[PDB]
Every structure is written in C-alpha cells, then in structure tokens.
Write a protein that binds this ligand. Structure first.
Ligand SMILES: CCCCCCCC[S@@](=O)CCO
Ligand SMILES: CCCCCCCC[S@@](=O)CCO
Ligand SMILES: CCCCCCCC[S@@](=O)CCO
Lengths: 343, 343, 343
C-alpha cells in the first residue's frame, strides 16, 4: 500500500500473512507453514527523466515458537532509472535467468524449484549489479534486455574468503556474468537468458558431485497472458549449476516447467503445472536421475485484491530409490491449504 | 496508528517502545529489560457482510548488544468474518483458554504467568484454527463462543516430526481441541473455557514429570469492568499442562489469579493482584508444591493514549526450598520501572 | 518520512537501502556489504510544554544468504521532554561521549571507529538513563548539557550476571556515569565530554590486556558548520576503555579525529579525514602501538534528499607488524562504493 507520496518521493509499504498448512506423508513436509512477508518500494523523482529507487523485502516465519524465530531478506537494492535509456541497480536482487523462468513460477504454493535461492544467477542472490534496457531506448515497445554481474560471494574462512562469506558451499559463487532478452506483444511472450558463473574453490574441493570450473545456464521461454488465460513454459539446460539434494550439483541438467491457468470472472483460478529436472551423467555411480519431477494441480480463489485462499496439490512423480534417499530428495505428495491477507 | 484506509482496505501499523528496568536480588531478573513491539492489523471489505483480515505482531528486544539481538513473532494469522455468522482465522494466534484468562492478565509488567507461550492451547502458539461466533448470530448481545483446533507442532528430528518441528519439548504439542464461552453485560463478565491437547512422544519419553496421554485445562472466570473500576478473577485446573520450571509438567495444578484496579480521572491507575499455581501430586518426591505464588502491587500513570510510565512490585511469596531450586523457579522479589511510548 | 500526524501524535517511519561494495586486499574486507536500516520516531503532545517520545532503529544486513541473515537494534528508547527544563529518556541509546565525538563521525562510509558499539559510554549501548538540558533552561541559546547513567550490563552466566547478560566481555559494562557540555553559535561548535564506567569482573579476569577497576574517557571537540563548509575535530584520551583488536583494551589511549568537507551547490560533497588511535603502555610486550591510523578521502553526490551515491577511500597508514597481526587489526586499504535510497 502507498502510505506516503509527497514532494517528489513515494513509498509503498506492502506485505502479507499466509496462514498455511502442509499435508504430507513426509513428516518433514507436514504441518504448519504459516509465514509473512514485509517490504517497501521507495521511489524519488530527481528530474523529469531520472528517478532513484530502493526496494527491500523480508520473510518472517509464523510457524515457529518464540524461542527461535527465523527470518531473512529476500531482496535489498538501490538504483537509478533514466527514461528511454535504462536502469542500474545493485544489491541482493533476482538473477537475470529469472527474467524468463519467473514466467512459470506462478503456482499457488509450489513450483519454481528447478533452482534455488543463492544458487548462482538463477534466482535471488547477493551482490547483483544489473543494467536493464526497457523497450530498446523507447524505439521497440516490448523488447527488453539486461546485462548482469554478480560479484564473488565466497567462504567465511580461509582461502576464497569474502567479507560476506558463507560456509555453505551451495550458497557461494565466484564472479558471474549473465544476460537476458525478452519480447512481449499483445499477451504473447518470448524470451532467452544465459548465465555464466565461476565456481569457488570450496565448492570444487569438498567431495561433492558436479564440480567444475564454471556454472552455466541456458534458458528459453514462451508465454501467453491475455483474455483470462495464462500459459507459460521454460526450458533451462544447466552445467554445474543445478543442486542435487545433498550430493552436490548436476554435471548436466535439463529443466522444464509448463503451466496452464484460467481466471474465472467470479474469482476462481485453477492451475495445472508440470515441473521436471533431469540429471545427466551425475557421476558417483548415478548416471541419469530425475532430480525433480511432479505434476501440480491447484486453485486460488480471489475474494479481492487484498484477500484470497488456495489449495495446491503436488503430485510427486519421483520414485523412492537409492538416488533420492542418498540425495535426501522428497518423493512424497504435498497438499497445501492457505489463507492469505495482503496489502 | 491507522496509516492507510482506501478503496475498501485499511491498515493499522502499531507498536511501542518500553524503556524498562528490573531490580531484583536474583541476578537473572536484574537489569535492563528494554524492548519494543511492532505490528500491523489489516482489514479488507470484500462485501457488505464479508471482511478479510490479517494480523502480525513482533517483539524485538532492546536490552541486548548488536552482536546478538533476539526477536520473535507473537501472532501471525489471516481470516474471514461474516456479519451475524462468525469468523474463521488460522496461524500463530492465542489459544481459546486465553479468552477467559486474559481477564486477569492486565498488570503493569508482571502477571499472566500461571501458563506460558507455546504451552498447549493456553496462550500464544502455532497453527491454531479458530472458529468464533459473536453475539450468538446477532441474537444475544454479549454471548460469545469459540471452537479451536491446534495441529501437531512436533519435534525437529526423528519420530513425531513436523515441518515446523522444535526440539524443546515444552514448546511441542499434539492435536488439540478447545472451546470457550463468555457473557458480558453492562460491565459484568463471566466465562468458561476448556482445552484438550494430545501430548507428543518426546514430552512423555524424556524423563520429565507430568507425563501422560493428554494435556487438559478447565477454566472459569469472572470480571467487572465499568465506572473506572476493574475487578477480575480466573481459576484454571490443569492436567499435564502447567510447566513446573525445568522439572517437567504438573500432573495436576490449580491456578488462581485475582486483580483489583481503579482508574483515577487525572490518569493514575493503581493495581493489586494475587497470582498462585499449586502443583498437586507432582511426583519426584515433592508431592504438593507451589509452582508460583506472589502478590503484585503497582501503578501506571497515563500521560495520554500514546504515553505512560509505571512501577510494578512483584512481592514473591514462594519459599526458597529444594523444589524451587531444582525447578529453577525464581522466589525473589522484582520491582519493574518502565517508560512507554506507543502508537 | 512522516506517515502519521493526528490528534496530538506524529510518527516518522524512516529507513534506507545502501547498495554497498568494498574493494580491499584484505579478503575479510572485500565484497558485497549491502544493508538496510529501518526505524520510527514517534512523538506525542501531552500538554503545551510536555511531550512524550519513542525511537527505534534497526539494521538488517543485505549481503547474506537467506539461511542465515543478521540484524540488530541500534537504538530503542522512550522519554519525556519539558519545554525550558529538559528531557529524560531510557533504553538502548547513544552514550554522552558521542555528543562530541559524533562531530567527526560524518564520513561517507568509514570513520567513527576509534571506539565501538557497546563499548562503555562511548557509543550505542544498553540501559542508558539520560538527562538533557537544552539551551540552559531557555536562558542561553546554544548551551547544552547532559548527565547520563548506564546500568551494569553483565555476563550471561555465573558471577556478575544480569538478566540481559552477555558472554562477550568487550560488550559488558559495570555501572557508569557520564556528562557532556556543548556550545554552538552561528556555525561554530565547541564541546567537552567525560565518562567513568566500572569494569565488570569477567573483563578483568579473562587474561586480556587493559584490565583495571574503571573505564574512563575524556573528550574535547571543535567544529564549524556553516556556508557549505564542514570542519570538525575531536580528541579523546581513554583509560581501559579503547578496544585493541582481540588483545583486550588499551591501558591508555590517545584518539584523534579530524575532518574537512565542502558542499557544492550542484550536489557534490568531497571529504578529507584523518583518524588515529595511539595505544600507550599496552603491556604484553607491546608498549606503544597505533591501534588505528588512516587517512580517508572520499565524495558523496546527492541527487536529492532521498538519493545519493558515494566513493570512500580508506588509505590505511598502519604497518603490518607483530602487534597488528596478533590483535587482528586490518592494515589494508578499503575503497567503498555505495548507492543509497532513503526516506
Ligand atoms: C547494457 C549495459 C552494458 C553494461 C556496461 C557496464 C560496464 C561497467 S561500468 O558501468 C563501470 C565502469 O567501471
Ligand atoms: C457448526 C460447526 C461447528 C464447528 C466444527 C468445525 C469442524 C471443522 S471442519 O469444517 C474442517 C474439516 O473438513
Ligand atoms: C539537576 C539535575 C540533576 C540530574 C541528575 C538526576 C539525579 C538522579 S535521580 O533523579 C534518580 C534517583 O531516584
């Protein structure tokens, strides 16, 4: 909600409370999942064509006792935007791969998990410097592109250390570069993205699988968003980038996400999605294994812009086998039931 | 404070800073206790008779250094309210036992501690699904009732695990059911509450006292709230529900709280309260011991709705003995001195 | 930003996002340093001459992954202000030594580090009770003084324990008393401050250097703040108060900070500063060592009140030697590059 707008600056304070419950045969995926998000979007008019902005978003879990409550920053960045030239922002933000893969990340509860947070330039992560050009200098409405640099987020000790270092190797990265191009026209969307990150010393020298010099993602995507119908698909082919449970990363992975949705006038929105991640030549005796594979059927009912409720059913297609147990990958179904207020 | 109210949605952002200091012979209860609370109450008009709402409240301690600052969510829930039918909400919220025991939880600093947070359905806890009926379908002004379900909040590992699991057994619970009825009329209040929770495997198989299949509370309460006078009393009889320091829980407990207050026109509000918790047949050689017992004398001076200061004197009536030392229960006096800004 | 002002109470919700990056040969000082701050300033008119107030400020780091995000309260206090008499506030707040040393704490990124947080009464710390007199009862415009008491912030276990205890001895303190006087007139500022804190048992009995009965600071300061020119200097002489890396504290220390700045009309603000901390008779074989010593050259460009960017270059003058390695003191340069949105 816009709670301030005065003398050239405005501030949107926004958030939500999701009363959320998971039902699953997997005990680790069963029970209260209530949480909230809080954020602000600030924007200031410097001149006719130049605006400064800042954004911050924070998740606070609501399913924990008061002795040990968990929370974190999703994004936190500042930037500058010049009309018919472009923008620059820096901070914790989304990787440019997500400019395309976000198109399928629209399920009621699940989805968007053929990749993780702090997972190279694929989703949210630290220290992105992002240059964006919107509508090609105002000459081609709908044509957007971005170039993105991610600085090294290293270890918390020893060699390859950064000031914001982290001992979990799955959350580290070296210097990376990425780009995205997208074109939207009368509801039809088409986009490509590419990212290339250096892998740090710790992630290649701790005995995990999917070691190598660089992490790489190549993404293509298509969507249709008009007349109350939402169709989208994305295919990403990764190298040393996709996480495989606890085992490490996938030498090669082929990720595919597809979604179909329809918005009824009275507020009902049914959703059918298919997500899949295929590990190829994973090593460690596993050759070719499904890292992820499930069908998602669900529905959100929008009371209005400020309130909704939804059910989401993750029909898990993975087999319980040696690879999934070793990696610690869930192969059980999850049904999500949620009640959501937002402002 | 209402910082937003527009096109059918309003948002109250509220909070306070309590500059607070404790004086006690017990070193663990002596010193700076400064803290703040922050929250929002959001509410949206869906129709003439249907409203959606969300609430979130957060405590941030202000008495710690910057290397290690502690904070937690008190409540976080969403819900729906239909006029002359009732409400439903879900999330971290207060247990329905508190619909009655809150009546004595009105002291300046102390009080309200014959029970804890995350202590079955007695106070704040995770995953409450709460149905409420207000004024009996609009036919009996003052008559309220509630039915409440709390889902299992289990361990963080092994058997009886939940996704929001917790290794502290005092903060766990199994499935529980509770109800409350209250009637208020021209300042006079009368109420009863009942709760029945299943106890998890860990809380019955870790060597503690007060083990058993279910936790149970039966509460009665009376109050008078009119003509600047506040009188209230509550009596709760619990089984395997009341915490006894570190020892475990009380097989049986008899809890009683009584308060008397008077609001002077110029802003002074003196308070006299008596709290007591009697453990019966506690085992471990005890067998009948006071778990809690103190008289509280205090006063709050309200400068206005936004500012006040208070002194609160917990005259501790417990004897320093084997049970209290073993349980780790404070038997020393505490004087609280506080300065409070709120909005 | 003032987001509420109604019926005698107003509330300023403020904050910023600093997209920040450090470049240094020291790996521990190199990389993403993005962070945000959030706070509110509340103030209520009780009468014509009496106002109640509350303030709270919070830092949330933006350079960490979502599994482990760090945050803390900077200040949290309530108080009362009577016109032409003075104010009283209590809580986590700034020590009165800072009434003078803040004058040099105005660099774009660095500076203000001849002392720490939770470092006796020198900067931010817990449990300050602060009495302030502004303009000497309204009889001498510009003449301010303060008396301040800090209650014991002790250990988290054993002897010398407080309820808000802390096991890091560098963040503990005993009872302390401090005072400040300042005089400002047509841009010219002059001030003195004195503080005297008791050192706790743990800080004198854990093998560190700079042990002794009391911590003491004596501070003098001068400044000029007018006609777009900012000049300021502070000299503090401390005893058992200044931190020396991990080694302990400095028996005696001589701290000096000097700054020169100029505000161009078009928004550029160049800054040149010199900071220095000289340890005297440190013991442990060290004798006389520079604890801190660097020159700071930098510049902030203000787009407007809500947006800016800056570069800050810490030219480190310390030699890499036995003392600096043992203490773990950085002797490498740091260049800071920041983009900042604030409201
Ligand atoms: C789409 C914009 C192309 C990226 C160019 C950025 C070059 C880095 S520059 O902005 C910093 C100068 O050191
Ligand atoms: C008039 C009904 C009394 C309240 C009982 C609530 C039952 C919960 S049920 O509707 C959810 C399980 O499907
Ligand atoms: C002349 C003003 C003196 C300021 C110091 C106040 C003394 C502390 S006292 O008021 C609290 C002990 O009860």
């Amino acid at each position: 909600a816009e709670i301030y707008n005065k003398d050239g600056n405005k501030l949107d304070l926004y958030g939500k409370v999701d009363g959320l419950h998971y039902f699953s045969d997997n005990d680790s995926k069963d029970g209260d999942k209530t949480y909230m998000r809080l954020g602000f979007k600030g924007e200031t008019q410097v001149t006719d064509q130049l605006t400064g902005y800042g954004q911050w978003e924070y998740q606070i879990q609501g399913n924990e006792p008061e002795s040990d409550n968990s929370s974190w920053t999703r994004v936190a960045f500042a930037g500058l935007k010049f009309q018919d030239v472009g923008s620059f922002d820096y901070g914790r933000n989304y990787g440019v791969v997500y400019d395309v893969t976000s198109w399928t990340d629209v399920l009621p509860e699940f989805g968007g998990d053929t990749y993780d947070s702090d997972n190279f330039m694929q989703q949210r992560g630290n220290g992105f410097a992002t240059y964006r050009n919107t509508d090609f200098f105002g000459l081609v409405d709908g044509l957007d592109f971005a170039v993105q640099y991610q600085g090294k987020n290293g270890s918390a000790h020893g060699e390859g250390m950064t000031t914001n270092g982290r001992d979990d190797v799955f959350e580290q990265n070296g210097d990376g570069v990425g780009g995205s191009i997208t074109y939207n026209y009368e509801g039809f969307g088409i986009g490509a993205a590419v990212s290339s990150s250096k892998r740090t010393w710790d992630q290649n020298n701790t005995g995990l699988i999917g070691t190598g010099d660089r992490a790489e993602t190549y993404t293509g995507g298509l969507k249709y968003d008009a007349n109350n119908i939402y169709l989208a698909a994305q295919y990403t082919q990764t190298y040393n980038a996709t996480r495989v449970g606890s085992l490490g990363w996938a030498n090669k992975a082929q990720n595919f996400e597809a979604v179909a949705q329809y918005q009824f006038d009275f507020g009902l929105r049914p959703s059918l999605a298919y997500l899949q991640s295929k590990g190829k030549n994973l090593g460690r005796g596993y050759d070719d294994e499904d890292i992820l594979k499930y069908v998602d059927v669900g529905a959100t009912y929008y009371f209005n812009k400020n309130m909704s409720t939804y059910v989401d059913y993750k029909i898990n297609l993975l087999d319980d086998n040696r690879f999934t147990r070793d990696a610690g990958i869930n192969t059980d179904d999850i049904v999500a039931l949620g009640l959501v207020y937002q402002f």
